[PDB]
């Protein structure tokens, strides 16, 4: 084994070979000179974080105020129009004219519309009228439906009036309590149909207030058989009506009351928690005698806990039973004398047991009585309890009409991620003289207007920021309304085993890597206070394979029209940006001439970022043709550009000249270099330049520069970054492309740091072997790894064959010992929006755990001995200077025949974290301040008996 | 097969359910020849 001095000098020669090759071939200093050479085609502008967040938060507040005004103007007409309705009972003569969706008539006439296709809508629509959706299990043409189908026809004019001031208005929907939903503009509905507007999350939040639910399940002997199957189905279909603001728990009683799950108190009832309760419900068996006093005493004690986070709102007890002779009136006179807890009772199944006590239980405690004889009645009887809970809110009047916004969810009409406004509509008939007040305490329905997340993204431009800088808005519950890591996919829970209705609620701590400092920032944003903090953060790469640590600055302010809070993540070296100023005619024609596809042989293969340069230039996702449209638009349009912004076009044109002048003046002289296969320049303007036409066909990176993983990683590092290729024969690239090396250019205009572009080359692996050799020994092994433990230059041929592979999958014994001696740290995190192939108990969404390795210690020299069973193995570790590489030499595994378990660094399916202990110490959250319950004027005399 | 059905009715197995299955509103096989369109006319009220 050679000495430390003889190995330190051996790696010293190669680190000069690698750095000098990349320094000169790419021409890092040449690009720096070009930017400094002119200094007059552009100006340096400051990037004030504090000013940006307030401006962006003002636009979001103003946008949500247009929709709020479009809702009060929409709900006022519905209240007034309905109060003038006469309730006709025969429509055979005066037929109702409406358009019914999902189609190609006793008392209705159908409309066949025109259905013109347009943009900002994924489907064909029509502004002439409003479509009407009726659930399958609801008969159109009934008196209840037909009467509702008339007075809602007056909403068509106010639907048009709302859209005239704001042509950028998305779906406007009225969800009636009868079941039908009328939306504008008219468009066809999207296998059988199971959509009910009354069960949608946006309808539910406007129907009532948050609630502290507690489900009591009867698991005595008499419920065994079919009526246990209906009880478990009714409970499961009822937890589907609970949002993130509602706290629920499930208990069972059969001569003894206990919790059915691992929670033991009220839990937030989010996506993960509701899965645990749902899983625990379909596990209960029926056995024992019935004890109602013990069941209700246990239930009333959990509602009075106050140690854990609750809703501090509607307190309700749900009793799922069949029948008994026990009234338990001694418990109700002890635990709720003030009637602060509602009791809803359900009699489930086909039986002959006494329902009298069950009916009496729900009548004294302001509840309601429900019958569920078969499966067909399960879905509708588990949602009518919101009529009772909305009674106090109706009597409030004008102070209960506040606009609310939902969690981020996928639109039913295939529109993407949207949020919906909410405002209830009340019966008003007879309220002018205040004489009816009989059905006037039930809402007519809920109004709603959809706001797409792409609408919000247009209010927070990000092309003047560094690719590492981004905006991100938060929610009171902590979830993210806006984030680069939020994807239009449902969040997965558990592991999918086989033998989109849920909202996309992604917490802030789950969007990016968690930190002790970041938790404090999250809590300061939730309670709505402005601030700022600069601290060192370790950042996960765009491709989940690397972790790098760099300084970041977080600046947040509350959007205090709504309850959201907006923040702007901005690193250093990005408080200034290059602003292009150029109005000369011939200097842009020459720059635009460099974009012609024909002369790539003299200027290199050129890519263009599919930015929204002008409104008439559609994105293409092809770039080969998109550039053809872009440059043909430049010469076929007056350069004044009155319809689109010149700032986003002046930058790309200015960067076109700078990249070309490097190619013509520097790259053209060296036609071929021994160790170079390709040379690329990626800039902030949004262009890529690969000099060889043949090598430009292997560029698999995203044309958008802000989405390039190597571009973002090279800005954080202050040295050449080696990016390992992929594996598993994922197309071409192993040997015929090369190894990518990049280095971000830094310019100093007036004492200001700026990183406008990156440059790099692709070192061929085969010629690097020749330099490395100056081989396949059976007694020694020499490998080169980067920051992340990926192979880049091996020694044993077969090792070099599996290039760009994690070192733990080819030598687990050495990799595990490296982590222990603190040279390769690792941080594990969960990906809640991932799709994985299901296993045994196409594809389904699941949680996948990610692992990323990075350099822990700053020290460059490592040495030591590892023992793997009656053998002593020695090794030396030296790290290349000005590079993220490490050279490790160890004798071959043949000497010591040991083989431990492989160490996998890949997207591995998991089901964690455990939800049974997260509820013990939940994350901080703030609940709504509106609480509408316990109103004295409530009638509640119709308990369950007037109906039968 | 007809004799077997008659024996089944003689033992009184499900004779009323056989009777209810011979009413006019029944489908009969395309193997038999009949005017197109009128396909459910086979079956007679004399079954009772």
């Amino acid at each position: 084994f050679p000495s430390a001095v003889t190995i330190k000098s051996w790696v010293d020669k190669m680190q000069e070979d690698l750095v000098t090759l990349a320094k000169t071939a790419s021409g890092v200093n040449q690009l720096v000179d070009i930017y400094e050479k002119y200094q007059d085609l552009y100006t340096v502008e400051p990037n004030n974080a504090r000013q940006l967040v307030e401006i962006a938060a003002r636009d979001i507040e103003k946008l949500l105020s247009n929709r709020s005004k479009a809702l009060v103007r929409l709900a006022l007409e519905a209240e007034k129009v309905q109060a003038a309705h006469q309730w006709r009972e025969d429509f055979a003569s005066n037929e109702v004219v409406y358009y019914n969706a999902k189609d190609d008539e006793p008392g209705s006439q159908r409309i066949k519309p025109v259905f013109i296709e347009d943009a900002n809508f994924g489907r064909q629509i029509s502004y002439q009228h409003a479509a009407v959706h009726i659930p399958t299990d609801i008969y159109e043409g009934s008196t209840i439906v037909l009467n509702e189908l008339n007075w809602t026809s007056a909403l068509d004019e106010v639907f048009k009036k709302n859209r005239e001031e704001d042509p950028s208005l998305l779906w406007q929907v009225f969800g009636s309590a009868t079941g039908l939903a009328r939306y504008y503009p008219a468009s066809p509905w999207v296998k059988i149909d199971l959509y009910d507007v009354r069960r949608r999350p946006w309808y539910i939040q406007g129907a009532a207030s948050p609630k502290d639910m507690l489900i009591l399940v009867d698991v005595s002997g008499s419920v065994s058989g079919l009526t246990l199957k209906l009880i478990r189905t009714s409970v499961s279909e009822m937890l589907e009506t609970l949002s993130d603001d509602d706290f629920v728990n499930v208990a069972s009683f059969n001569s003894n009351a206990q919790d059915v799950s691992c929670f033991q108190h009220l839990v937030q009832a989010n996506v993960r928690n509701k899965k645990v309760l749902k899983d625990a419900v379909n596990n209960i068996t029926a056995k024992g005698i019935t004890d109602y006093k013990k069941g209700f005493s246990f239930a009333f004690e959990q509602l009075l806990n106050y140690n854990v986070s609750r809703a501090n709102c509607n307190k309700i007890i749900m009793l799922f039973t069949d029948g008994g002779e026990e009234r338990a009136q001694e418990i109700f006179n002890k635990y709720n004398k003030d009637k602060k807890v509602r009791v809803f009772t359900f009699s489930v199944g086909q039986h002959n047991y006494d329902r009298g006590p069950i009916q009496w239980m729900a009548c004294e405690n302001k509840g309601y009585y429900y019958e569920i004889p078969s499966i067909g009645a399960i879905r509708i009887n588990t949602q009518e309890y919101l009529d009772v809970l909305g009674r106090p809110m109706v009597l409030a009047g004008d102070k209960a009409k506040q606009v609310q916004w939902t969690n981020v969810y996928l639109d039913a009409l295939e529109l993407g991620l949207v949020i919906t406004g909410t405002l209830p509509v009340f019966n008003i008939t007879g309220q002018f003289e205040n004489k009816t007040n009989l059905k006037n305490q039930l809402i007519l329905g809920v109004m709603g207007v959809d706001v797409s997340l792409e609408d919000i993204k247009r209010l927070t431009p990000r092309f003047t920021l560094c690719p590492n800088g981004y905006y991100f808005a938060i929610d009171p519950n902590g979830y993210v309304l806006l984030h680069p890591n939020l994807q239009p996919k449902p969040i997965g829970v558990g592991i999918p085993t086989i033998n989109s209705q849920e909202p996309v609620t992604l917490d802030f701590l789950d969007a990016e890597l968690e930190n002790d400092i970041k938790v404090e920032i999250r809590n300061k944003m939730i309670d709505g206070e402005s601030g700022e903090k600069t601290f060192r953060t370790l950042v996960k790469s765009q491709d989940e394979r690397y972790i790098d640590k760099g300084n970041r600055t977080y600046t947040w302010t509350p959007v205090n029209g709504t309850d959201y809070s907006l923040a702007l993540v901005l690193p250093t070296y990005s408080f200034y940006y290059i602003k292009a100023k150029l109005e000369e005619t011939i200097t842009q024609a020459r720059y635009s001439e460099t974009l012609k596809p024909d002369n790539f042989e003299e200027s290199g293969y050129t890519f263009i970022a599919p930015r929204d340069y002008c409104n008439d230039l559609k994105i293409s996702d092809n770039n080969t043709e998109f550039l053809l449209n872009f440059n043909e638009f430049i010469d076929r349009k007056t350069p004044n550009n009155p319809s689109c912004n010149a700032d986003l076009i002046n930058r790309v044109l200015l960067d076109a000249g700078f990249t070309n002048e490097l190619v013509q003046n520097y790259w053209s002289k060296q036609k071929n270099i021994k160790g170079v296969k390709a040379r690329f320049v990626v800039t902030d303007g949004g262009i890529t330049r690969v000099y060889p036409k043949e090598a430009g066909e292997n560029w698999q990176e995203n044309p958008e520069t802000y989405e390039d993983s190597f571009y973002k990683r090279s800005l954080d590092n202050d040295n050449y970054v080696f990016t390992a290729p992929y594996f598993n024969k994922s197309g071409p690239g192993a040997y015929e492309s090369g190894i990518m090396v990049s280095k971000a250019v830094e310019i100093y205009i007036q004492g200001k740091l700026l990183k406008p572009a990156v440059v790099g080359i692709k070192i061929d692996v085969n010629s690097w072997i020749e330099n490395f050799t100056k081989r396949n020994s059976d007694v020694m092994d020499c490998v080169i790894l980067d920051d992340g433990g990926f192979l880049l230059m091996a020694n044993h041929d077969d090792y070099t064959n599996q290039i760009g592979r994690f070192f733990g999958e080819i030598d687990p014994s050495l990799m595990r010992h490296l982590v222990n001696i603190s040279v390769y740290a690792f941080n594990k995190s969960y990906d809640y929006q991932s799709v994985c192939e299901p296993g045994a108990a196409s594809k389904q969404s699941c949680i996948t755990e990610q692992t990323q390795y990075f350099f822990d210690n700053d020290s460059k020299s490592f040495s030591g001995v590892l023992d793997c069973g009656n053998c002593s193995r020695i090794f030396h570790g030296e790290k290349l200077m000005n590079t993220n590489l490490i050279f490790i030499m160890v004798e071959s595994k043949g000497t010591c025949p040991c083989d431990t378990r492989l160490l996998i660094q890949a997207e591995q399916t998991s089901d964690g974290p455990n939800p049974c202990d997260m509820v013990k110490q939940p994350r901080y959250r703030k609940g709504p301040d509106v609480c509408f319950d316990n109103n004295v004027l409530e009638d509640y005399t119709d308990c369950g008996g007037v109906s039968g | 097969q007809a004799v077997l059905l008659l024996f089944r009715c003689a033992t009184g197995e499900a004779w009323q359910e056989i009777m209810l299955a011979c009413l006019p509103g029944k489908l009969c096989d395309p193997e038999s020849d009949y005017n197109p369109g009128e396909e459910y006319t086979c079956g007679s009220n004399f079954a009772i």
């Binding site: - | 077997l4 089944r8 033992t11 009184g12 197995e13 499900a14």
Partner: protein, 96 residues
């Protein structure tokens, strides 16, 4: 017992699965002589419990005696006759 033991054990499941295709399953042909399921994507293999949950069959002396006593009381005898028609064919079971 002598004529037929364990013939009513082949109903037509879905292809490459273990779920019975029909809601009221009936046996296939034991040797390709009785009834064959000709539903799109169905095949049958000997792995079925039996017509009445295994209570009605001729694969035991007690089971055969119970079936004979059930048939001699003119109760559900045609059900067993038709199941054997589905299993074997149309010539032997009617005599028995």
């Amino acid at each position: 017992l002598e004529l037929f033991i364990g013939k009513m054990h082949k109903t037509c499941f879905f292809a490459d699965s273990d779920i019975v295709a029909e809601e009221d399953p009936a046996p296939c042909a034991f040797s390709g002589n009785g009834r064959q399921c000709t539903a799109n994507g169905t095949e049958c293999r000997s792995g079925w419990v039996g017509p009445n949950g295994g209570i009605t069959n001729f694969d035991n002396f007690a089971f055969a005696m119970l079936t004979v006593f059930q048939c001699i009381t003119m109760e559900g005898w045609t059900d067993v006759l038709y199941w054997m028609n589905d299993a074997m064919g149309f010539e032997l079971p009617w005599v028995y």
